[PDB]
Amino acid sequence: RKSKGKYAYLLESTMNEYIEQRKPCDTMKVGGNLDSKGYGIATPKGSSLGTPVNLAVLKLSEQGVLDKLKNKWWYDKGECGAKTSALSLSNVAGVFYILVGGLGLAMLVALIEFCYKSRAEAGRKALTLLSSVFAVCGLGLLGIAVSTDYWLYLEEGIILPQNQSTEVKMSLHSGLWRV
């Protein structure tokens, strides 16, 4: 239940079909049986009920009582129930979010273009300042970037399969020339 598809417990069939039909519905049974065994009602060695119990079990097999009592305990009193080969709307789903988010962006731009151009019907100073500010900020940001060492983080560790949690062995905040 915890290993996420890494462990396959080889057990008895009827304990496997029990635990499958048992809350939480987390495990299942694949394939068929590996050997063939059998359960038997068992008498001492020379009992009186050696033959009538033998004829009882065969009579219950043919009437279907042993299957009626099988569907009751393993399956009826069991807290469970009982692939499409195609891309669904969960695979290509952010595409419909970028599309709808692009149409919603466009109509609020059509509101802004309408208000800006209706009041336009009713320069060098800007481009001088916007060129200089975006330059000296761009001079500032790359200047900080080249000198400061936080370009790349690098964590190497080991796996601990209990919880599949990890433990570090190494961690970096490396830079352009500074580990």
Ligand X SMILES: CC(C)CCC[C@@H](C)[C@@H]1CC[C@H]2[C@@H]3CC=C4C[C@@H](O)CC[C@]4(C)[C@@H]3CC[C@@]21C
Known binding residues for L-glutamate are 12
d(CA 154, CA 17): 47
CB-wise, 58 or 139, nearer to other proteins? 58
Size of the site for other proteins (CB under 8 A): 69
Work out whether 116 is an interface residue with ligand X (CB under 6 A).
yes
Q: How far is the CB of 142 from ligand X (least distance, A)?
A: 23
The sign of the dihedral angle between the CA atoms of 139, 140, 145, 146 is: positive
Q: Which of 56, 65, 98, 109 binds ligand X (CB under 6 A)?
A: 109
Which range touches other proteins (CB under 8 A), out of 19-27, 78-86, 151-159, 163-171? 78-86
Output the CA torsion 43→46→48→53 (10° steps): 30
Q: Which of 2, 27, 41, 151 binds other proteins (CB under 8 A)?
A: 41
- Grouping H, G, I as helix, E, B as strand and the rest as coil, residue 156 is strand
Which residue's entry shows tokens 């100073």? 125
Q: Which contiguous run of DSSP H or E holds residue 165?
A: strand 165-170
CB-wise, 101 or 157, nearer to ligand X? 101
Work out whether 80 is an interface residue with other proteins (CB under 8 A).
no
- Grouping H, G, I as helix, E, B as strand and the rest as coil, residue 91 is coil
CB-wise, 47 or 171, nearer to other proteins? 47
